[PDB]
């Protein structure tokens, strides 16, 4: 579910390992872990 979750994980993997966050259209943004 969610706007490409798996791929989103990537954005987190690259951006920051914060398993939790928010997804957008085609965007993604983790939290403070």
| Pairing status of strand 28-30 against strand 21-23 | antiparallel
Q: Which of 28, 25, 27, 26 is nearest to 17 (CA)?
A: 28
Residue for token digits 């994980």? 9
Task: Please state how this structure was obtained.
Answer: NMR
């Amino acid at each position: 579910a969610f706007c490409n979750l798996r791929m989103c994980q990537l954005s987190c993997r690259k951006s920051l390992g914060c398993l939790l966050g928010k997804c957008i259209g085609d965007k993604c943004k983790c939290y403070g872990c």
